[PDB]
Scaffold this active site. Structure first.
Site, short mmCIF file in Angstrom:
data_model
loop_
_atom_site.label_atom_id
_atom_site.label_comp_id
_atom_site.label_asym_id
_atom_site.label_seq_id
_atom_site.Cartn_x
_atom_site.Cartn_y
_atom_site.Cartn_z
N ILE A 78 70.12 31.13 33.46
CA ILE A 78 70.61 32.10 32.49
C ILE A 78 69.57 33.20 32.27
O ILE A 78 68.59 33.02 31.52
CB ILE A 78 70.98 31.40 31.15
CG1 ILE A 78 72.42 30.90 31.21
CG2 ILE A 78 70.85 32.39 29.99
CD1 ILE A 78 72.81 30.23 32.51
N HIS A 79 69.80 34.33 32.94
CA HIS A 79 68.93 35.50 32.89
C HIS A 79 69.71 36.74 33.29
O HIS A 79 70.94 36.73 33.32
CB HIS A 79 67.76 35.30 33.86
CG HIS A 79 66.94 34.09 33.57
ND1 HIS A 79 66.23 33.93 32.39
CD2 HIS A 79 66.71 32.97 34.29
CE1 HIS A 79 65.61 32.77 32.40
NE2 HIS A 79 65.88 32.16 33.54
N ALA A 80 68.99 37.82 33.59
CA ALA A 80 69.61 39.07 34.04
C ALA A 80 70.82 39.56 33.23
O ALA A 80 70.97 39.23 32.05
CB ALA A 80 70.00 38.95 35.52
#
Lengths: 333, 87, 332, 87
Positions: free
Chosen positions: D13-15
Site C-alpha cells: 500500500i503506497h503510491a
DNA sequence: CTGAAAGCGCTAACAG
DNA sequence: CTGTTAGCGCTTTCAG
C-alpha cells in the site's frame, strides 16, 4: 506590514515611485539616488512583494503548465525544456497534472487563469472542439506542446507524427520487409488513430503492400503493454518480420518480450522505437528510434509563448520541428 | 566575424546545450548569427536555432558583427567545446 | 476590465463584504441573500482574482518546489507525489530546477518567497550552513524530501540511507561474498559520503571484512558513469563478486557494461541497485534493488507541510519512511 | 463495520493507490481506521497510512463508526479492489 | 446578518 | 528626475 516600499522611501527621504523605479531598474534615477535607496533596501532587508506587484501591474510573470503526467519519462523532459526557457525569460511556472481527464483539464485551465497567469502551455492527448472553444476565449495566450489539434487554429509546436511513422515504415520496406507491425497507443487519442496510424498505412499503400489489421496492436504507452504486444504478434498464423512502436517504453518492452521467447534481436526480428528518450540507450541491444526533439518542443513552445505574451507579431503560430530516424543495434544492416 | 565548426556532439545542436549557446550569444550587443548549410538564423533566438535541426556531422558557421563581436565569437568558441558541441 | 466583486455586489443590492462572505462560504449569511448573490454570480460570469484575494488575505493557496532536475526518473516521481498530495488540499505548485547550484537554489528560495508562497518543499544533495541560515529567514514553512541535512534543523522526510546501504551489504555477505564493491555518487554530496558510504563501511567490519579503497567507484548517477564503473572494477586483479550501486540508472550501466564484456549476470556477478525505479524493472535480468518509497516521500513531505502551514502542531518534524529490499533476477 | 483484506499489490500500500484509498476513506463522516500488525492509523490521513509501510502479502481491517459506516466500507471495498489492493 | 471603515503592497502618469 | 494622484480586486472588522 513589515518593511514595505514605504519604509524604504522613508529611509531614503524619497518617494515610493522612486523606490519603485529603483527596484524595477528604471533609467530615470540619479545614480546618487539609486545608490541611497539601494542602501536602505539592504539596511532593512527589503524583499519586494510579487503579489502586490501583480495587482498593480496586471501581470504575474508566471505561466500555467498543464501536463498529463509529470512522472513520465517523456513529459518530464518535455517540461524541463519549458522550465528552462521560462527561467531564461524571467518567468515562473505553475505545474499541474491532468491525467488526460477532460474535466480536470478544463478545470485547471480556469483555476490557472484565476491565479492570473500571463500565459499557458498545454499538453493534452484529446483536444476536443470544446477545448479549442475554451482556448479562444482566454485573456492570455495559449500554446500547445507535442499535442495534436485537428481544427489546428490554436498555436502549437510539435513534429509531423504522420511523416515520422511513414519514414520509419518506408525505411523497413527499403530493407526488404513485407509484413511490418505497428504497435500503437490508445486509438482514442487522435495522434494515434489520425496521425501515426495513417502514416503507417500511407507507407504500405505507397509500397503496394496490403493493410493487415492483425499487424496492428494497441498498447497503452506502458512497458507491460509492450510485452503483450509482441506476444499477440508472434502468436498469429502470419507473423511480422519487423515491428514499429509508437513509444520507446513500449518498444523497449517488445524487445524483452521477444528476448524471453528465445527470439534474438535484431537477428530474428527488426525493432524500431519512437521518441528517442535516454531509455533507448539503456537497452540491449541499443534501440533504433525515431528522433523527436522533446526538450526542443518544450523550449520552442515556451519561447513562442513569451512572444505572444509581449504581443510581438509572429509568422505562423503552428510550428513543425524537424525529425529524423536514428538506427542503432535494434535493427539489421 | 566568422568561424566554422563541426558538430561533434552526439545529440547535435539541441536540448540544454543549445540553450547555453543561445543564452551565451545573447549577452553580447553585437548581432550574432548561426548558418547551417542553407539558411541562417539569429543565434540569440531559441526558435531560430532549434528549428534548423542540426545533427552530429554538420558544418555550421557562427558570425558576429558589432562592438563586442570579438569577445562574443570568443565566448562562443568556449561554449562549443565546454559543452561538447563542435570543434 | 473583468467583472469585479463590485459588479456582483450591485447586481444583488449587497455590499462587497457579503459577496466576499458567500464566495468564501462564510456562515453569517442568510440563505435568501446567499442564493441571491450565488446566481447573481453565474449571471455575470464572475471569476475571482487569486492575486487580489492573495494581497488582502496574506495567503495564496500555492506552494513552492525546488527540485534539482525534473527530468530525472527519480525526482519526476517524487514531484508527482508532491503535486498530488498538494491538490488534495487545494494547493497549487510552482516548480523550478536548481541543478544543485547553490546560487540558483537560494535565488529560487528568494524568488519563491517573493511570490508569497504559503510553504516550500526543498530537495538538494548538499544542504550547507549558508543554506540553513537562509531557511530560518522565511515567513513560511519549509520541508525537505529525500535530502540530507547534517545540522538537523529543518523538517525532512526521507529514509535511513545509512542503514539502507547496510541492509544491502549484509544480505550480500550472507550470500558468501568476500570482496564486495560500491558504486557511489558524487562524494561532493553529503548523502553519498556521510551516509551511503558509512552504512557500507560499517557493514564491512561488522562482518569482519577488510575495507578495500579500490572497491569504491564514484559515478554521478549517470548510466555512462555506471559502465565506466564496472569496467574500472574488473581492471585490477582483486575483482568483486557482487557490486552495489547508489542509483538504478547506474546499476543498469554496470549490468550492461558486464554483458558487453562477456560475463553473464547473475551467472558471474551479483548487482543491486537502489531506488526501485521502474527502471530496475525494464532490464534483463530484472535488477534487484533497495526499495525507497519515492512517491510516498513526496506525498508525506507535502502533507507534513499542509500541517505546518495550518499551524497545527505535529509530533516530531523529522520523518523516516520505512524502506526494504526486493530481490529479483540480478542475484543468486 | 469492518473487514479483512489481503494486500495483493506488487508494491504493497503506497503510491497513487494509497492516495486514492485515503481520499475515498475521507469522503465520509465515518472515522475510518487501519489496523495492521496491531498498530492503527486514521485512513483519512496520508502520513499515518504511508508510515506503516504496508508491503505486499499482509492483512488489515477497515473500521467505521459513524452515520454512514456502511456506505463507507462498500465504497472502500470498491477501490480496495479497483486499485488492485487485495480483497 | 450585514454594511461601512481601511487598507494589503505596489505600479502609474504627468506636471513642474 | 521626482513627487503626486488614485486605485487594482479583495478581505477585514465591527458597529448597528
Amino acid at each position: 506590514m513589515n518593511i514595505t516600499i514605504y519604509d524604504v522611501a522613508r529611509e531614503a527621504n524619497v518617494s515610493m515611485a522612486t523606490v519603485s523605479r529603483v527596484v524595477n531598474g528604471n533609467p530615470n534615477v540619479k545614480p546618487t539616488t539609486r545608490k541611497k535607496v539601494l542602501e536602505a533596501i539592504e539596511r532593512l532587508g527589503y524583499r519586494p512583494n510579487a503579489v502586490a506587484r501583480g495587482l498593480a501591474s496586471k501581470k504575474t510573470t508566471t505561466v500555467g503548465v498543464i501536463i498529463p503526467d509529470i512522472s513520465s519519462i517523456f513529459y518530464s523532459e518535455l517540461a524541463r525544456g519549458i522550465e528552462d526557457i521560462a527561467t531564461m525569460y524571467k518567468y515562473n511556472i505553475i505545474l499541474s497534472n491532468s491525467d488526460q481527464n477532460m474535466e480536470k483539464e478544463l478545470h485547471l485551465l480556469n483555476t490557472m487563469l484565476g491565479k492570473q497567469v500571463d500565459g499557458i502551455v498545454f499538453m493534452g492527448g484529446n483536444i476536443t472542439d470544446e477545448h479549442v472553444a475554451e482556448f479562444k476565449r482566454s485573456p492570455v495566450p495559449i500554446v500547445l506542446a507535442a499535442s495534436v489539434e485537428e481544427q489546428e487554429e490554436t498555436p502549437s509546436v510539435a513534429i509531423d507524427y504522420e511523416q515520422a511513422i511513414y519514414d520509419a515504415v518506408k525505411l523497413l520496406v527499403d530493407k526488404g520487409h513485407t509484413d511490418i507491425a505497428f504497435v500503437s497507443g490508445p486509438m482514442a487519442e487522435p495522434i494515434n488513430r489520425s496521425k501515426k496510424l495513417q502514416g503507417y498505412k500511407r507507407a504500405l499503400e505507397e509500397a503496394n503492400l496490403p493493410f493487415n489489421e492483425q499487424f496492428v496492436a494497441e498498447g497503452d504507452y506502458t512497458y507491460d503493454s509492450g510485452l503483450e504486444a509482441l506476444q499477440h504478434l508472434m502468436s498469429l498464423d502470419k507473423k511480422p518480420t519487423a515491428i514499429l512502436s509508437a513509444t520507446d517504453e513500449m518498444a523497449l518492452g517488445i524487445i524483452h518480450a521477444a528476448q524471453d521467447q528465445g527470439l534474438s534481436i535484431p537477428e530474428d526480428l527488426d525493432i524500431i522505437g519512437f521518441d528517442n528518450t535516454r531509455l533507448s540507450l539503456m537497452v540491449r541491444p541499443q534501440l533504433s528510434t525515431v528522433v523527436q526533439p522533446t526538450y526542443d518542443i518544450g523550449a520552442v513552445a515556451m519561447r513562442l509563448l513569451t512572444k505572444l505574451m509581449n504581443k510581438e507579431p509572429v509568422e505562423e503560430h503552428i510550428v513543425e520541428l524537424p525529425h529524423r530516424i536514428e538506427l542503432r543495434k535494434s535493427t539489421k544492416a | 566575424a566568422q568561424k566554422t565548426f563541426k558538430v561533434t556532439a552526439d545529440s547535435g545542436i539541441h536540448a540544454r546545450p543549445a540553450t547555453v549557446l543561445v543564452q551565451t550569444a545573447s549577452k553580447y550587443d553585437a548581432d550574432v548569427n548561426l548558418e547551417y548549410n542553407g539558411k541562417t538564423v539569429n543565434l540569440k533566438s531559441i526558435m531560430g536555432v532549434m528549428s534548423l535541426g542540426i545533427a552530429k556531422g554538420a558544418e555550421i558557421t557562427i558570425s558576429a558583427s558589432g562592438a563586442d563581436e570579438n569577445d562574443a565569437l570568443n565566448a562562443l568558441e568556449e561554449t562549443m567545446k565546454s559543452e561538447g558541441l563542435g570543434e
